[PDB]
Design a protein around this ligand. Sequence first.
Ligand SMILES: [Ca+2]
Ligand SMILES: [Ca+2]
Length: 72
Amino acid sequence: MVYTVSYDVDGTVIKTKVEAGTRITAPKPPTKQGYVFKGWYTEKNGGHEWNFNTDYMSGNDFTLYAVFKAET
Ligand SMILES: [Ca+2]
Ligand SMILES: [Ca+2]
């Protein structure tokens, strides 16, 4: 089974197809001027960080959301 992982970077979404039960290969990390990339999360707010080393592709399409933190 192959599903789509959508990568959403502040609403810009890129779709990649991934075989269920395999590890997902992370994209090159996004960048945002004045901000720091904090990782890919299962929700834009209130989810958890996907760990591409430990995590396995689900048997469904899903979206990973880039989270950024302002530089301080
Ligand atoms: Ca946004
Ligand atoms: Ca949420």
